[PDB]
Amino acid sequence: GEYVVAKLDDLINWARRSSLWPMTFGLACCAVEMMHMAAPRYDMDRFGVVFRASPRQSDVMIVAGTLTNKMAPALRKVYDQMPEPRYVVSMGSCANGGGYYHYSYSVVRGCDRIVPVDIYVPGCPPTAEALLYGILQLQKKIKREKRLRIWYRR
Amino acid sequence: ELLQVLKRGLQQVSGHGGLRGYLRVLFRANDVRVGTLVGEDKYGNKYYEDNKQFFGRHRWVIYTTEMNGKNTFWDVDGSMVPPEWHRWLHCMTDDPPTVKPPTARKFIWTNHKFNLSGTPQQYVPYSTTRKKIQEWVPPSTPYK
Amino acid sequence: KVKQDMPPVGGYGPIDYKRNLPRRGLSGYSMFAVGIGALLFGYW
Amino acid sequence: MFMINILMLIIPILLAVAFLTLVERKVLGYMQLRKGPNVVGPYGLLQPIADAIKLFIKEPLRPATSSASMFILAPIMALGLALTMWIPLPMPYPLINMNLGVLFMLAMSSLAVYSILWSGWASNSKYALIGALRAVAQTISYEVTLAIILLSVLLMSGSFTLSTLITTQEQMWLILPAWPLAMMWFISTLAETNRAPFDLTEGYAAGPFALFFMAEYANIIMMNIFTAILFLGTSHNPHMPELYTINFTIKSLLLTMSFLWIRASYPRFRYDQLMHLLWKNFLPLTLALCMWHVSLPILTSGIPPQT
Amino acid sequence: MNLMLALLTNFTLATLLVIIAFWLPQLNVYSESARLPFSMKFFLVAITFLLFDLEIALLLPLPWASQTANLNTMLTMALFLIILLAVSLAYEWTQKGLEWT
Amino acid sequence: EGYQVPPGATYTAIEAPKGEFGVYLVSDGSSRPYRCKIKAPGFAHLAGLDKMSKGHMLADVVAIIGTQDIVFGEVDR
Amino acid sequence: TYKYVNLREPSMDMKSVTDRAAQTLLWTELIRGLGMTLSYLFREPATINYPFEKGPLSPRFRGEHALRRYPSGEERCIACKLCEAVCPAQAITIEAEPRADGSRRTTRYDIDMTKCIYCGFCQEACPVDAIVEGPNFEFSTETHEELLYNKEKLLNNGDKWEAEIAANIQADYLYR
Numbered sequence A: 001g002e003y004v005v006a007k008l009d010d011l012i013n014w015a016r017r018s019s020l021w022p023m024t025f026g027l028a029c030c031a032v033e034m035m036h037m038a039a040p041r042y043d044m045d046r047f048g049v050v051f052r053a054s055p056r057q058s059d060v061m062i063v064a065g066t067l068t069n070k071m072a073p074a075l076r077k078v079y080d081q082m083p084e085p086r087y088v089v090s091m092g093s094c095a096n097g098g099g100y101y102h103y104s105y106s107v108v109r110g111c112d113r114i115v116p117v118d119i120y121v122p123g124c125p126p127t128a129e130a131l132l133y134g135i136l137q138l139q140k141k142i143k144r145e146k147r148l149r150i151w152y153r154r
Numbered sequence B: 001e002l003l004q005v006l007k008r009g010l011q012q013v014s015g016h017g018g019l020r021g022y023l024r025v026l027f028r029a030n031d032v033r034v035g036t037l038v039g040e041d042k043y044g045n046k047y048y049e050d051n052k053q054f055f056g057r058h059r060w061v062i063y064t065t066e067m068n069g070k071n072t073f074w075d076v077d078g079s080m081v082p083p084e085w086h087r088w089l090h091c092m093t094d095d096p097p098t099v100k101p102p103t104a105r106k107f108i109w110t111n112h113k114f115n116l117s118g119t120p121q122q123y124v125p126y127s128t129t130r131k132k133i134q135e136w137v138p139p140s141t142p143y144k
Numbered sequence C: 001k002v003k004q005d006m007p008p009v010g011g012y013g014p015i016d017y018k019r020n021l022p023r024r025g026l027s028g029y030s031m032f033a034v035g036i037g038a039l040l041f042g043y044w
Numbered sequence D: 001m002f003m004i005n006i007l008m009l010i011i012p013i014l015l016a017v018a019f020l021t022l023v024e025r026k027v028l029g030y031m032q033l034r035k036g037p038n039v040v041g042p043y044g045l046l047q048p049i050a051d052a053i054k055l056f057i058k059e060p061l062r063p064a065t066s067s068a069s070m071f072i073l074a075p076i077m078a079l080g081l082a083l084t085m086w087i088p089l090p091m092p093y094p095l096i097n098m099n100l101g102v103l104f105m106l107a108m109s110s111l112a113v114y115s116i117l118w119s120g121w122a123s124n125s126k127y128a129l130i131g132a133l134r135a136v137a138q139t140i141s142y143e144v145t146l147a148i149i150l151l152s153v154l155l156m157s158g159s160f161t162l163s164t165l166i167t168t169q170e171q172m173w174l175i176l177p178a179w180p181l182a183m184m185w186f187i188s189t190l191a192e193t194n195r196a197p198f199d200l201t202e203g204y205a206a207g208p209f210a211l212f213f214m215a216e217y218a219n220i221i222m223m224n225i226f227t228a229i230l231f232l233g234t235s236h237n238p239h240m241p242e243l244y245t246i247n248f249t250i251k252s253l254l255l256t257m258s259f260l261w262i263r264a265s266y267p268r269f270r271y272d273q274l275m276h277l278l279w280k281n282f283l284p285l286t287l288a289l290c291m292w293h294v295s296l297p298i299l300t301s302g303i304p305p306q307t
Numbered sequence E: 001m002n003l004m005l006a007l008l009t010n011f012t013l014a015t016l017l018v019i020i021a022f023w024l025p026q027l028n029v030y031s032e033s034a035r036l037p038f039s040m041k042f043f044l045v046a047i048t049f050l051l052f053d054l055e056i057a058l059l060l061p062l063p064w065a066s067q068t069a070n071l072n073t074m075l076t077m078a079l080f081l082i083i084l085l086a087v088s089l090a091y092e093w094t095q096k097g098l099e100w101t
Numbered sequence F: 001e002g003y004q005v006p007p008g009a010t011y012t013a014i015e016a017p018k019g020e021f022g023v024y025l026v027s028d029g030s031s032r033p034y035r036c037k038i039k040a041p042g043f044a045h046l047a048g049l050d051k052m053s054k055g056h057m058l059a060d061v062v063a064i065i066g067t068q069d070i071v072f073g074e075v076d077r
Numbered sequence G: 001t002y003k004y005v006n007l008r009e010p011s012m013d014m015k016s017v018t019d020r021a022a023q024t025l026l027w028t029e030l031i032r033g034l035g036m037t038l039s040y041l042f043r044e045p046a047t048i049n050y051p052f053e054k055g056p057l058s059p060r061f062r063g064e065h066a067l068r069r070y071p072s073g074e075e076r077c078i079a080c081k082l083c084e085a086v087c088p089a090q091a092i093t094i095e096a097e098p099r100a101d102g103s104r105r106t107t108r109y110d111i112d113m114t115k116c117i118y119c120g121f122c123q124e125a126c127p128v129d130a131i132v133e134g135p136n137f138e139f140s141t142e143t144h145e146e147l148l149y150n151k152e153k154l155l156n157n158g159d160k161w162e163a164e165i166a167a168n169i170q171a172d173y174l175y176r
């Protein structure tokens, strides 16, 4: 039976990582490099990552830019609306830890104070390629999941 | 010309060593182009070029199937490219390390490591300074 | 001898910038004529 | 035997819809100087399978406190009606040979607007209800011209039987005598299926969303098969029926691609602007061409036979 | 009976896909009528569609009617009906019934 | 430390792609600016959206925002 | 000097009016736009095959930081704190003391890579080429903590990447 569960886990993992539909929170300059990842040279859609998805149809949230205090409740509301399984990719220094604005009165010092984060992409901004590296790193993280294996040992 | 186009498509099957080799690269790299082998690194990554392709597609690497004890037949990473080939592959230079080798230093890593995040080899930060204030240690003998 | 990025001696060749949207197709008269001709052949 | 026949229509319809999602993404990709899906399976061939699996094992959220009776009834009606639209299609033989097949398709599609209406009610959100009521108004409005155009074409065919359209076009495609009608029919199917540049809704989750998407793309392929039959009739040889199926399938594919080609090429209408396109442009012309096509067979002595 | 089987199969498979879509395993063990502010213009579109739809119902028999021997009467009434549809549209048009501003 | 700037205040502007982009820079004589007001052209343009959208439809507001060329990095600073 | 972008009068002859009517009723300019997307369908796409192919970069590229050595293996950094002073993000933290051989060396050299703006000012300010931004840009992590670099991490980056870093410096140092 362990052979069947291991194969079933592999199938659902393959489907979920082969079909990552992102909801992009294009908050600032990091959104532009996200655009260049959707652009022809890198074509994120060729990996099965559609260009744009509504929050209720998205599998991954990409926080691409500075998260201010005024914005934080809105971002948390959208995260709570995502169907599961859901993942968060934090892109750029601002989202990772506040970046250039870490010491400002109006900025959240890292989006991981508001939502759990799966992947941190460094850079100000990360290059389009660097973000793509992070997405492919998220895929490998999903490939490691063993949800059904852990379910049947409960 | 459609026959020349189809002949070239057939020549890719033979250029990759037959049907099996053609299918392996098709499924590993989603690409069946045949280039000129520029060199191979000590980890097994192979580097190819075809200057008739447009800038950006004129150089590529076919990653090794195993690197530092990790099966990489399907799990390939951009960080598997070692630094000496990294420069060539990103077009920071024209000359591969087979033509212009890097300068040797005793302290340079002999073995490249890829991204180790998420594994037991991941970096964990810590303070590198020693304790600043020394506390008084009371005497071990009794005398109140 | 100083060497820095410079244009070639004599400069670069001319660069186009003006809009170039060429005129194509038939006049309105001919387009209606072909359309009406097609209708009459079909009706017949 | 007939149960086999039903399944040999339903199952290919669903697979054709699944792989249209791949073709649309790749055709749009190359029109945009990119590639589209080419990693998940060779040339993206496994992408539709990955997408379908991903969608069905996703958390199936519900609005909660909703007319959930109609949250579930909206996609059942949408998919059930979409699959029902195929049973009279002659390819070259229909699953069900209906005497009034053309009118059966008109009747069934007119019901498809309910799944829009019910889904807006089931959202519990007043702004979603407004969007649904805007989509319904667009859909019923373009139902008007689709019906009148269809009736005009049937005055050259002479019956409501879909397979008679094949007989009518043995010598010549109906697009030649009726290219003005075909132009408005084709644009009407775009606005009817809420396709770009009429995709104003884009101006549900998990499996329920997948079922709404599959119903919509089943209708897109269906309307393009109907277009090919109505205006690009294929010649049917009774002793080699698969020759008909090959040629008619190619025409249907090319028309469906043209839906993707159009999506890649144009901006999006404003709501009032696509309502003015129907009520102030298509409908005035459609009424005039209906009068013309009622008179034309009589004054040429080309009235078609009843039988 | 064939048509019933086709209809029953189509909507039964649709129901099965929708209920299955909701009842797949989740692997979790923890707890889970007024006046709409909608324009009168949309009501008039629906009513306008309904009245034009009724007119289309009357035009549907036209392919059969063209087989009559009494073609002079048939053609006159067909054009009479369509012209009245045209007049209905023109009345809506000139009375600003098709505006959205 | 950086170079010290002689005390004074300037309003300097250029024809940026989005409009007139200026800075009102105040120097107190030290190596750090005393005050730096950034004039972002999109600030005044977005303030005109209500005026410009008068008598238009909902879908037009999307076009009018686009025609103004609005980046909120400069509007909000 | 200026030009008008849209100051024109359509001709009102019959041939011109009939040209515009045909465009209205036959959709000619819409059909023309279809032609252009059709031409792109048959053009070779610009997509590269990442990660087997990489976008081109220059020797000046500002990527992951590293601490460098002299050929002898001695650290270049002499704890001058110019990098810390110039850092626009205050992303660098340094402590220093005399080494056991009397050398002026750091006991702490941290870079918060989530504060850093990857501006390169530190490598401009360094008088001894000790701190550089290397060519690596593929170092995303699964946790925030992994991006808080201490001196050990940064020295290891220098030893890992020196082969490429030295070659890049060799190509650009005459521009500096």
Ligand SMILES: CCCCCCCCCCCCCCCCCC(=O)OC[C@H](COP(=O)(O)OCCN)OC(=O)CCCCCCCCCCCCCCCCC
Pocket (backbone or CB within 6 Å): C035, C036, C039, D180, D181, D182, D183, D184, D186, D187, D227, D231, D262, D266, D277, D281, D282, D285, D292, G024, G025, G026, G027, G030, G031
């Ligand atoms: C011998 C006597 C015979 C008597 C009969 C003679 C009749 C022949 C002469 C009449 C021909 C009429 C042609 C009918 C087509 C519809 C015409 C039409 O309505 O087009 C105008 C419409 C609105 O025009 P607009 O510029 O927006 O505003 C004008 C109002 N002031 O603008 C539009 O509708 C544009 C469409 C918008 C959607 C764009 C996406 C489609 C573009 C690709 C089209 C591909 C072609 C379709 C092929 C279909 C094949 C099945």
Ligand SMILES: CCCCCCCCCCCCO[C@@H]1O[C@H](CO)[C@@H](O[C@H]2O[C@H](CO)[C@@H](O)[C@H](O)[C@H]2O)[C@H](O)[C@H]1O
Pocket (backbone or CB within 6 Å): A012, A084, A085, A147, D052, D053, D056, D057, D058, D059, D060, E024, E025, E026, E027, E028
């Ligand atoms: C096309 C048919 C293919 C049939 C394949 C059948 C495979 C059956 C295995 C299903 C695996 C589902 O895996 C599970 O999915 C649900 C959503 O649906 C996720 O979500 C679920 O768990 C999380 C917590 O873990 C909850 O917060 C959530 O509310 C719950 O819905 C789980 O995190 C994921 O572990």
Ligand SMILES: N=C(N)NC(=N)NCCc1ccc(I)c(Cl)c1
Pocket (backbone or CB within 6 Å): A021, A050, A052, A053, D017, D018, D019, D021, D024, D025, D048, D049, D051, D052, D055, D210, D211, D213, D214
């Ligand atoms: N709209 C997008 N997000 N892109 C897109 N065209 N996705 C389509 C993905 C899809 C949806 C339903 C099914 I069933 C299948 Cl097989 C595939």
Ligand code: SF4
Pocket (backbone or CB within 6 Å): A028, A029, A030, A031, A064, A065, A066, A091, A092, A093, A094, A095, A099, A100, A123, A124, A125, A126
């Ligand atoms: S991390 Fe840099 S590029 Fe990204 S939003 Fe912040 S300042 Fe802009």
Ligand code: SF4
Pocket (backbone or CB within 6 Å): G083, G086, G087, G088, G089, G090, G091, G092, G111, G115, G116, G117, G118, G119, G120, G121, G122, G123, G133
């Ligand atoms: S690159 Fe700029 S922000 Fe980052 S450590 Fe160097 S000086 Fe500081």
Ligand code: SF4
Pocket (backbone or CB within 6 Å): G076, G077, G078, G079, G080, G081, G082, G083, G084, G094, G122, G125, G126, G127, G128, G129, G130, G131
């Ligand atoms: S890295 Fe360079 S600038 Fe920074 S403290 Fe060391 S020697 Fe000084």
